Amino acid sequence: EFEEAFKEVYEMVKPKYKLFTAGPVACFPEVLEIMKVQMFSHRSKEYRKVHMDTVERLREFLEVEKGEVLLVPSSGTGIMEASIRNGVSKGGKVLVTIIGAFGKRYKEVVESNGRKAVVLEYEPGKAVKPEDLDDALRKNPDVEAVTITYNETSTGVLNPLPELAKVAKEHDKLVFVDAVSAMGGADIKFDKWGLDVVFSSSQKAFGVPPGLAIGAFSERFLEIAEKMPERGWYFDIPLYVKYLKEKESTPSTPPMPQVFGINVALRIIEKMGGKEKWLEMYEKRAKMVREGVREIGLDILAEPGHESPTITAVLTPPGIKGDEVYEAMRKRGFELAKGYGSVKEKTFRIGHMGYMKFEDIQEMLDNLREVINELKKQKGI
């Protein structure tokens, strides 16, 4: 009846580019289709069934048996905040490992919530070393938890989580993991690696629209949380666990479309053969992108052996800014990602998450080569 109301907004949001973004990312058509289904009550038997099926699929995917998996109505950073209000004493110290922009965000989340942050920082492109963590924990024995950015989206680096988590546990510390750009793209074995908190978002490796956060919490974390004073209501983890058990839903209204979308995404992974084959696909995309930029004669930021399977930070040739590549590719129909953080000018990024065909990547790379050559000639280099 109000076609024009729809058409007016469509003109602003209609598909314009082939997406190689850092999040949100291109969603699979099956996911987009479920996003338009009519709503109904989140307290209904119909919804409770879907909410729980999604949680079950995530417990399987994340290999969680002893801990709890929750769906939260917020972006991933919501659980980042939750980890601090629930698992660290007021004024308590947190050893925040920083290898990029999001490690810095965790620090801000720690401090803004009344906790203290002890930093172990590296230059963009480097990954945290287990030996340095052990060293840091040695001289900072009063810290209660350690945060690890599994996949640093600003640098295209994947931290060696298993080994880092091992070291943290040897010091009997809580392990908090920001896996926003890692979950669904890099493996996570929650119980086995001894993680206490891991969180992610719907709009990265899972290829679902933004609006939902996914969290997994250990028994150890939950025991501390239920006794943690003034942790609030919106991110009261024990409250969420109680609602999941009793009402098979969330305390407040959940982002239903995104939940349906994640369920579809999990079924897609199952259809293709399971988690292993899905992660294999991600590694093949990453490889193709890295090898492709290498052919063009460009270097990447990530140190060898720690390259991200979800995104690559490419260093621009001398005299060219990341923004210039971003804008030039857009004019050719390709949306990459601007550099982020302290390397925003010396790099641009290429995401390889969500709906992405190998042929589209190849086409993107051929256009990038021309963009690079043209910018060089343009500037006389």
Ligand X SMILES: *Cc1c(COP(=O)(O)O)cnc(C)c1O
* Residue 102 is labelled as binding a ligand: yes
* CA dihedral over 338, 341, 344, 346, signed as positive or negative: negative
* Residue 75 is labelled as binding a ligand: yes
User: Residue 194 corresponds to which tokens in the numbers above?
Assistant: 């001894």
Cβ of residue 101: shortest distance to a second copy, in angstroms?
A: 12
Q: Are 212 and 265 in contact (CB under 8 A)?
A: no
CA proximity to 133, closest of 175, 89, 101: 175
- Give the residue with the Cβ less far from ligand X, 102 or 282: 102
Q: Restricting to residues 170-209, which ones interact with a second copy according to CB under 8 A?
A: 201, 203, 209
Q: Are 21 and 351 in contact (CB under 8 A)?
A: yes
Cβ of residue 99: shortest distance to a second copy, in angstroms?
A: 19
Among the listed ranges 121-129, 170-178, 334-342, 371-379, the one in contact with a second copy (CB under 8 A) is: 334-342
Number of residues that bind a second copy (CB under 8 A): 91
Among the listed ranges 70-78, 183-191, 305-313, 370-378, the one in contact with a second copy (CB under 8 A) is: 70-78
Instruction: Using DSSP, state whether 49 is helix, strand or coil.
Output: helix
* Residue 74 is labelled as binding a ligand: no
Does position 73 interact with a second copy (CB under 8 A)? The reply is yes
Does position 85 interact with a second copy (CB under 8 A)? The reply is yes
Cβ of residue 66: shortest distance to ligand X, in angstroms?
A: 25
- Give the residue with the Cβ less far from ligand X, 75 or 342: 75
Q: Could you write out the DSSP letters of every residue in 121-152?
A: E--TT----HHHHHHHHHH-TT--EEEEESEE
Q: Could you write out the DSSP letters of every residue in 352-371?
A: --SS--HHHHHHHHHHHHHH
What whole-number distance in Å separates Cα of residue 18 and Cα of residue 171? 46
- Say which DSSP state 317 is in: P
* Residue 253 is labelled as binding a ligand: yes
Does position 89 interact with a second copy (CB under 8 A)? The reply is no
Q: Restricting to residues 245-274, which ones interact with a second copy according to CB under 8 A?
A: 251-258, 260, 263-264, 267-268, 270-272
User: Residue 78 corresponds to which tokens in the numbers above?
Assistant: 């919501």
Q: CA 336 from chain center: how many Å?
A: 17
Cβ of residue 241: shortest distance to ligand X, in angstroms?
A: 18
- Contact with a second copy (CB under 8 A): which of 71, 95, 109, 325? 109
Numbered residues of the known binding site for pyridoxal 5'-phosphate: 75-77, 102, 153, 201, 203, 253
